[PDB]
Scaffold this motif. Structure first.
Motif, PDB file in Angstrom:
ATOM      1  N   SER A   1      -5.445  -0.364   2.845  1.00  0.00           N
ATOM      2  CA  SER A   1      -6.856  -0.579   3.087  1.00  0.00           C
ATOM      3  C   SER A   1      -7.503   0.635   3.749  1.00  0.00           C
ATOM      4  O   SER A   1      -8.580   1.093   3.329  1.00  0.00           O
TER       5      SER A   1
ATOM      6  N   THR B   1      -9.486  -5.688   0.526  1.00  0.00           N
ATOM      7  CA  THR B   1      -8.067  -5.722   0.840  1.00  0.00           C
ATOM      8  C   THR B   1      -7.631  -6.966   1.624  1.00  0.00           C
ATOM      9  O   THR B   1      -6.488  -7.372   1.560  1.00  0.00           O
TER      10      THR B   1
ATOM     11  N   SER C   1      -3.938  -8.994   2.259  1.00  0.00           N
ATOM     12  CA  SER C   1      -3.274  -9.077   3.584  1.00  0.00           C
ATOM     13  C   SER C   1      -3.386 -10.437   4.257  1.00  0.00           C
ATOM     14  O   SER C   1      -2.437 -10.873   4.902  1.00  0.00           O
TER      15      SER C   1
ATOM     16  N   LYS D   1      -2.932  -8.442  12.934  1.00  0.00           N
ATOM     17  CA  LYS D   1      -1.864  -7.998  12.062  1.00  0.00           C
ATOM     18  C   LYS D   1      -0.612  -7.444  12.796  1.00  0.00           C
ATOM     19  O   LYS D   1       0.464  -8.032  12.732  1.00  0.00           O
TER      20      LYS D   1
HETATM   21 CL   LIG Z   1      -6.100  -5.314   5.038  1.00  0.00          CL
END
Ligand SMILES: [Cl-]
Ligand SMILES: CCCCCCCC/C=C\CCCCCCCC(=O)OC[C@H](O)CO
Ligand SMILES: CCCCCCCC/C=C\CCCCCCCC(=O)OC[C@H](O)CO
Ligand SMILES: CCCCCCCC/C=C\CCCCCCCC(=O)OC[C@H](O)CO
Ligand SMILES: CCCCCCCC/C=C\CCCCCCCC(=O)OC[C@H](O)CO
Ligand SMILES: CCCCCCCC/C=C\CCCCCCCC(=O)OC[C@H](O)CO
Ligand SMILES: CCCCCCCC/C=C\CCCCCCCC(=O)OC[C@H](O)CO
Ligand SMILES: CCCCCCCC/C=C\CCCCCCCC(=O)OC[C@H](O)CO
Ligand SMILES: CCCCCCCC/C=C\CCCCCCCC(=O)OC[C@H](O)CO
Ligand SMILES: CCCCCCCC/C=C\CCCCCCCC(=O)OC[C@H](O)CO
Ligand SMILES: CCCCCCCC/C=C\CCCCCCCC(=O)OC[C@H](O)CO
Ligand SMILES: CCCCCCCC/C=C\CCCCCCCC(=O)OC[C@H](O)CO
Ligand SMILES: CCCCCCCC/C=C\CCCCCCCC(=O)OC[C@H](O)CO
Ligand SMILES: CCCCCCCC/C=C\CCCCCCCC(=O)OC[C@H](O)CO
Ligand SMILES: CCCCCCCC/C=C\CCCCCCCC(=O)OC[C@H](O)CO
Ligand SMILES: CCCCCCCC/C=C\CCCCCCCC(=O)OC[C@H](O)CO
Ligand SMILES: CCCCCCCC/C=C\CCCCCCCC(=O)OC[C@H](O)CO
Ligand SMILES: CCCCCCCC/C=C\CCCCCCCC(=O)OC[C@H](O)CO
Ligand SMILES: CCCCCCCC/C=C\CCCCCCCC(=O)OC[C@H](O)CO
Ligand SMILES: CCCCCCCC/C=C\CCCCCCCC(=O)OC[C@H](O)CO
Ligand SMILES: CCCCCCCC/C=C\CCCCCCCC(=O)OC[C@H](O)CO
Ligand SMILES: *C/C=C(C)/C=C/C=C(C)/C=C/C1=C(C)CCCC1(C)C
Ligand SMILES: *C/C=C(C)/C=C/C=C(C)/C=C/C1=C(C)CCCC1(C)C
Ligand SMILES: *C/C=C(C)/C=C/C=C(C)/C=C/C1=C(C)CCCC1(C)C
Ligand SMILES: CCCCCCCCCCCCCCCC(=O)O
Ligand SMILES: CCCCCCCCCCCCCCCC(=O)O
Ligand SMILES: CCCCCCCCCCCCCCCC(=O)O
Ligand SMILES: [Cl-]
Ligand SMILES: [Cl-]
Ligand SMILES: [K+]
Ligand SMILES: [K+]
Ligand SMILES: [K+]
Lengths: 239, 239, 239
Positions: C53, C88, C92, C219
């Motif tokens: 990304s 993106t 994800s 993340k």
């Molecule tokens: Cl992402």
């Protein structure tokens, strides 16, 4: 000069994929309901997705000309980019993985994880080919794509094999896994040697032929071997 | 002249989808945890995806003008292309298939295989509508799309029914499968008769109305019937 | 003036994601085959998708300038749109949900339904940012996106927790679910306060930093906590 070299590499697989589809309908029409029949379906869809890819390229829908960045061997030159190949792999490679996962009888937790990595591989490979601002970003996307490929290879090479031994399909799975690993490794080699990468080979028609040849084996021969074995061993698979 | 004919076919379903969503929240709020509740979720998402599709079309985000190729009835003329319809079906049709697969309690091996074929159908249908270089490639993509549709129909018509009889949901599944098969067959007929195909009907507003009517039944009525039955038979489904 | 403010928010996460990947390879190399090893794979893929990304944004591949519509605080002005972020997330966020679903050991019926809603959320969020004809359609897509988000939140907040208690992973799941719910709620707040929404904050570099900070926690920190626990409790997870 090679409009003909490029176009023949595409029409040849429209014909071969079409023949494979007819042969597979013939081969699997009597397969028993369940798992065996599902694999037959995937085996039919691999060449159908392949034909869509080649029609996108032949029609011009999924092809454009891109200009290579500073530092590339063809910096400041226009190159034909068959991005439709890279895009369509996002649908056909998961189908190949689906066929192999149905065969090895893997849990969908593992199948979902491997298809996710596989899609990451294909999306980043496309980004690598479509990026034009700097040579660095093209190779950075190629490297990330390789990283996703390793996750897929690890699954073939290990977890999935465990599942196959337990489904009674270890032998056919070993044959198909090795063929897949070997042929799949050829796509990033073609990419790095051809126009998109190092440009050691500067003919887009030649590189197109390299991919077409890999497709014949990775998709059509792969699927025939798989389908022939499942038709001949359907009790084991439904079991 | 028909900006109004076209725009009304879109706003009408934004209203109907919105009403369906409210009605479904009302109908499923008390459904028991588990499988029954998952189907309620899918039933809510079918109209939510549908509203997104209509907003893309009304806003102009997913609409463009395309010129028809030599040999087409409208060769060398600009036609409005609602490609957002074709694109969004790649998300809403798998949701319908998800709802039906949860209902029939199919193994995800089968569900994954059918959704894969369904996505192939939608992607190739979009390619058919977006291709403009030659009339031949438009129909070649339409034919491949039909081939993927056959794989989906085979699953409804056979494998999935097996799964339903074993989940205690054969009767509701027979009703919904027949309604789905019949209504889904209407989309390629509309495509072939309207501007994209043979152009026997040259009004894009009329063809838009044909799709909108199919959507009301294939999505909203479909989902209401499914949700009403699951709310009334939740013990069977959680079981 | 802030090319530097914007670019630093991107390079910083290319570095952090890269470090996370190395740390995770180190942490999970010895994890036992099966479910534990699958979660390790997802944990590796979250930062790999994140790096893709940021490379799309840094290279310019997934960034464009868009003009805001009448009624927007910046009506008739060009705004930088990092649409690659929104695009993106479609890959994800399902990986994060996959990791959580593998952890809670949910049935893939539920996992598929939640990932479907999650993709709907991401696709409609992208549409919200890319729509330019009218301010109304931007907020209509934002609202639909919120509706899909509620479906995902309902699953975390309820169904999935049921699955975790039964897999022996309730405690780690409660920690990660709360962290996810809290951090995920921050993305639509940033969107509504920044340039895309109300423009209360008109710096795209500032808003980019807001997302980058959310990414570090949603993340990388998320994945480290998850991976550390699974490495330390692999018997429970393989079980
Ligand atoms: Cl992402
Ligand atoms: C059920 C599956 C059915 C699948 C469908 C059948 C596939 C047929 C494929 C190839 C035929 C060969 C076509 C070769 C056409 C070559 C054209 C050349 O043309 C050069 C130049 O453009 C001139 O001006
Ligand atoms: C599914 C079944 C698929 C079967 C598919 C056939 C198998 C391949 C063999 C022969 C056809 C080859 C056709 C080659 C045509 C060459 C035409 C050239 O174009 C001529 C000229 O340039 C125009 O202007
Ligand atoms: C594009 C140019 C034209 C190209 C040609 C059009 C393609 C289809 C043609 C023929 C049917 C193929 C036959 C497929 C097999 C039929 C079923 C057989 O079933 C036998 C069964 O195994 C007994 O027990
Ligand atoms: C487990 C993995 C271990 C991986 C370990 C890999 C370490 C790197 C090795 C060799 C680099 C050789 C580089 C040679 C560079 C030549 C110059 C190039 O750049 C030319 C450009 O056009 C500007 O002039
Ligand atoms: C096992 C250990 C393996 C270690 C392997 C290390 C491999 C080399 C890494 C990075 C090269 C970074 C090169 C950066 C070159 C910048 C050149 C200039 O161009 C920048 C471009 O314009 C920007 O947009
Ligand atoms: C085990 C193996 C793992 C493999 C992981 C692969 C990651 C590749 C990364 C960077 C390549 C950078 C290449 C830079 C080339 C710049 C020069 C150009 O020139 C091309 C050609 O050599 C002109 O003759
Ligand atoms: C199990 C088997 C293991 C097999 C392992 C195989 C490893 C091959 C690695 C790297 C090739 C790198 C090729 C780089 C080519 C660069 C060419 C340059 O050429 C420039 C030009 O010729 C003058 O300026
Ligand atoms: C919880 C779900 C809530 C869902 C949300 C509610 C949906 C409302 C839909 C339609 C109302 C009708 C709107 C009709 C607008 C017609 C405009 C016409 O305008 C013609 C022309 O442009 C003039 O100049
Ligand atoms: C979820 C709940 C959704 C409920 C949705 C409502 C149901 C439909 C009924 C009435 C509204 C119809 C509104 C029609 C407006 C027509 C406006 C025309 O535009 C006027 C003029 O052209 C401007 O310039
Ligand atoms: C766009 C223009 C405005 C359009 C209007 C905005 C949409 C929402 C409005 C009202 C709430 C709908 C009610 C949904 C049902 C609520 C729950 C009931 O629950 C009863 C339960 O079954 C007892 O046991
Ligand atoms: C199991 C499936 C069996 C499928 C069997 C299908 C066989 C084909 C049948 C009829 C074709 C009729 C074709 C009529 C063509 C008319 C001309 C058209 O082309 C006009 C164009 O504009 C240039 O002038
Ligand atoms: C059961 C058996 C069913 C058998 C069914 C057979 C159906 C007909 C097949 C192929 C038509 C191919 C038509 C090719 C026409 C070429 C015309 C010219 O235009 C080419 C275009 O420009 C290129 O780009
Ligand atoms: C069981 C049924 C299976 C169905 C499988 C369907 C595959 C359709 C393939 C090709 C259609 C080719 C149509 C070519 C039309 C060219 C002429 C145009 O004109 C349109 C209109 O007729 C002007 O009046
Ligand atoms: C179980 C029920 C089975 C039902 C089976 C139904 C099969 C219908 C098939 C083909 C229609 C093809 C229509 C092609 C129309 C072409 C029109 C042309 O028109 C040109 C113009 O009018 C003058 O030049
Ligand atoms: C295994 C995973 C490996 C992951 C890969 C390693 C990631 C390295 C990241 C960032 C380094 C910092 C780079 C900062 C570059 C800043 C450039 C600035 O440039 C400003 C302006 O453009 C000038 O003219
Ligand atoms: C996976 C491992 C990833 C490790 C990644 C490194 C960690 C961050 C620390 C130091 C590097 C920072 C580099 C900052 C470079 C600033 C360059 C500026 O650009 C200079 C000038 O503008 C050009 O023209
Ligand atoms: C982009 C600029 C360059 C950036 C640097 C290139 C990235 C890779 C470098 C080093 C290896 C990282 C080490 C990863 C861990 C290795 C395995 C350890 O395993 C120990 C095990 O736990 C014992 O039991
Ligand atoms: C369960 C969910 C319940 C949800 C209940 C929500 C009801 C709406 C509440 C407040 C709206 C306040 C609106 C204030 C509008 C100010 C004007 C704006 O429009 C300005 C534009 O630029 C033209 O001038
Ligand atoms: C619990 C109950 C919650 C109830 C919550 C109700 C919230 C408000 C709903 C809709 C606003 C519709 C506004 C329409 C404004 C049109 C303004 C003009 O611009 C139109 C634009 O140009 C077109 O393209
Ligand atoms: C529980 C909470 C559920 C949340 C669901 C959220 C749905 C949001 C919908 C519409 C917002 C419309 C905003 C319209 C703003 C128009 C004015 C602009 O101006 C921006 C700024 O205020 C200049 O200073
Ligand atoms: C049917 C086609 C098949 C099997 C295609 C497989 C393609 C790949 C394994 C592509 C791999 C690549 C990398 C690992 C690095 C980036 C370049 C790619 C996308 C060619
Ligand atoms: C909610 C919308 C639904 C149920 C849409 C279904 C759409 C199809 C079954 C489309 C089918 C098509 C073909 C089989 C041939 C190519 C043209 C299409 C895409 C309309
Ligand atoms: C790794 C990145 C993560 C976890 C991103 C999460 C993003 C969201 C939860 C986005 C949500 C949004 C809405 C609910 C409304 C529309 C605006 C969005 C797309 C930002
Ligand atoms: C087996 C399930 C796989 C799920 C894959 C989801 C993402 C698919 C994206 C496919 C893009 C293909 C577009 C093809 C266009 C063409 O072939 O001409
Ligand atoms: C139920 C799982 C389905 C998985 C489908 C993966 C591919 C989805 C692609 C959806 C594209 C939709 C874009 C919609 C834009 C709009 O509606 O305005
Ligand atoms: C875990 C399974 C998820 C399945 C998701 C299917 C749809 C994925 C679409 C991903 C689009 C991402 C494109 C990224 C480009 C970039 O990062 O530069
Ligand atoms: Cl392909
Ligand atoms: Cl839709
Ligand atoms: K083109
Ligand atoms: K448009
Ligand atoms: K750009």
């Amino acid at each position: 000069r090679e409009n003909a070299l490029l176009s023949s590499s595409l029409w040849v697989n429209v014909a071969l994929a079409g023949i494979a589809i007819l042969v597979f309908v013939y081969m699997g029409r009597t397969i028993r309901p369940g798992r065996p029949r599902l694999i037959w379906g995937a085996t039919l869809m691999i060449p159908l997705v392949s034909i869509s890819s080649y029609l996108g390229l032949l029609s011009g829908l999924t092809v454009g000309m891109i200009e290579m960045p500073a530092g590339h061997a063809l910096a400041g030159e226009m190159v034909r980019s068959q991005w439709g190949r890279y895009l369509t792999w996002a649908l056909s490679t998961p189908m190949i993985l689906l066929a192999l996962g149905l065969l090895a009888d893997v849990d969908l937790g593992s199948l979902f994880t491997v298809i996710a990595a596989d899609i990451g591989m294909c999306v980043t490979g496309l980004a690598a080919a479509m990026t034009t601002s700097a040579l660095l970003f093209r190779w950075a996307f190629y490297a990330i794509s390789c990283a996703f490929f390793v996750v897929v290879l690890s699954a073939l090479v290990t977890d999935w094999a465990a599942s196959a031994s337990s489904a009674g399909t270890a032998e056919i799975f070993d044959t198909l896994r090795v063929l897949t690993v070997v042929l799949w490794l050829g796509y990033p080699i073609v990419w790095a040697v051809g126009v998109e990468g190092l440009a050691l080979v500067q003919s887009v028609g030649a590189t197109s032929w390299a991919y077409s040849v890999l497709d014949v084996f990775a998709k059509y021969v792969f699927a025939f071997i798989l389908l022939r074995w499942v038709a001949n061993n359907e009790r084991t698979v439904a079991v």
